[PDB]
Design a protein around this ligand. Structure first.
Ligand SMILES: CC(=O)N[C@@H]1[C@@H](O)[C@H](O[C@@H]2O[C@H](CO)[C@@H](O[C@@H]3O[C@H](CO)[C@@H](O)[C@H](O)[C@H]3NC(C)=O)[C@H](O)[C@H]2NC(C)=O)[C@@H](CO)O[C@H]1O
Length: 340
């Protein structure tokens, strides 16, 4: 039962690794090492070496059994462009593979993650397959030469097995992934948000839903234990067109605070300051509103329902993005209690 959380290094001054309740997790990710084009000597951002080294000993103090991975890349156009340049150059792929493995060992991580959004179109998937195949082989070779258990290898995936469901240009090769990786982190969120003119459930379990995306990976043949269901610790926000239309599907005029996203902890403050929370059974989600601000998110009820869903679907577990955004670890606690 994988209970996974991502800790973003940007948050260090407000939420250092020491604040993570690592009792509630089996695996915790450092986000992110950088690709460091053009040499592709993968590294943590210069200046953050101490933070990266101390991460694993720190989180293990509260739960020695917890393991860690370092995630390389992250969402965003610069990372995507760097992976696309990397994956087309055999020499660069070799430098990336060697340096990534060395990085994980250097800082005491138990594994590596790729976060690449996204390996599309078809050329980019084909080249990503070359990178990942080479990385899997080198991980096995390093275990052989060091005598240590092999590094874990995971990657972030889009919510759906097809890139993209409305216009398929490529798709994740599930048998390849199952053979090469320990699991994938299914990004079952950002379905709805301020790019749209109406409020919606940004991580709806059902209704662009988490269950349809999960179904697509299973139908393609992914072993269910290789899927880890993502659950956001942030909400997507809108400004309402009219303060008396406050439900799902209400008209909106742009992004709410802060640039369209609010941490769970900020949402708790929003509710304590007078916003009304509503559970939406139709989507398995929550929303809250006050005056012209509306936010959709996951709450204690929807998280328990999503985690039970993952269990019923025989998934490997769940992950949170990102742990600094529930400072009191409310949602990680209910998730852990739900699974058992
Ligand atoms: C052809 C068409 O209209 N397609 C629609 C899709 O574009 C839309 O996908 C969503 O698009 C938005 C905006 O590009 C994505 O939001 C971004 O997501 C990233 C990563 O999750 C996040 O870091 C950004 O902050 C966020 N940007 C903003 C402005 O919030 C979102 O991920 C896309 N979601 C999915 C599931 O692809 C979908 C779904 O709304 O609808 C199609 O009709």
């Amino acid at each position: 039962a994988l209970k996974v959380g991502f800790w973003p290094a940007y948050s260090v001054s407000e939420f250092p690794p020491s604040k993570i309740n690592s009792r509630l997790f089996t695996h915790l990710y450092y986000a992110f090492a950088e690709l460091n084009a053009p040499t592709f000597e993968v590294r943590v951002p210069p200046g953050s070496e101490k933070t990266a080294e101390d991460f694993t000993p720190t989180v293990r103090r509260l739960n020695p059994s917890v393991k860690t991975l370092i995630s390389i890349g992250g969402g965003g156009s610069e990372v995507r462009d760097n992976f696309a340049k990397l994956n087309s150059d055999a020499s660069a792929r070799q430098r990336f593979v060697k340096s990534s493995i060395a990085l994980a060992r250097r800082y005491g991580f138990h594994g590596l993650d790729l976060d690449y959004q996204y390996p599309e179109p078809q050329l980019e998937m084909e080249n990503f397959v070359k990178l990942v195949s080479e990385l899997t082989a080198a991980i096995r070779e390093e275990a052989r030469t060091s005598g240590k258990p092999r590094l874990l290898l995971t990657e972030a995936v889009y919510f759906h097995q097809k890139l993209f469901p409305w216009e398929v240009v490529t798709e994740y090769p599930v048998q390849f992934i199952a053979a090469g990786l320990d699991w994938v982190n299914v990004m079952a969120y950002d379905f709805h948000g301020s790019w749209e003119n109406f409020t919606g459930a940004p991580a709806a379990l059902r209704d662009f839903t988490a269950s349809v995306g999960i179904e697509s990976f299973l139908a393609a043949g992914m072993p269910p234990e290789k899927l880890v269901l993502g659950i956001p610790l942030f909400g997507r926000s809108w400004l309402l067109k009219n303060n008396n239309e406050v439900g799902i599907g209400a008209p909106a005029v742009g992004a709410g605070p802060v640039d369209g996203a609010l941490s769970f902890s900020e949402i708790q403050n929003f509710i304590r300051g007078g916003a009304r929370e509503v559970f939406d059974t139709t989507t398995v989600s929550a929303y809250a509103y006050k005056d012209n601000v509306w936010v959709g998110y996951d709450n204690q009820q929807s998280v328990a329902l999503k985690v039970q869903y993952a269990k019923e679907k025989r998934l490997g577990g769940y992950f949170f993005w990102s742990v600094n955004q529930d400072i009191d670890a409310i949602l990680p606690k209910i998730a852990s209690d739900t699974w058992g």
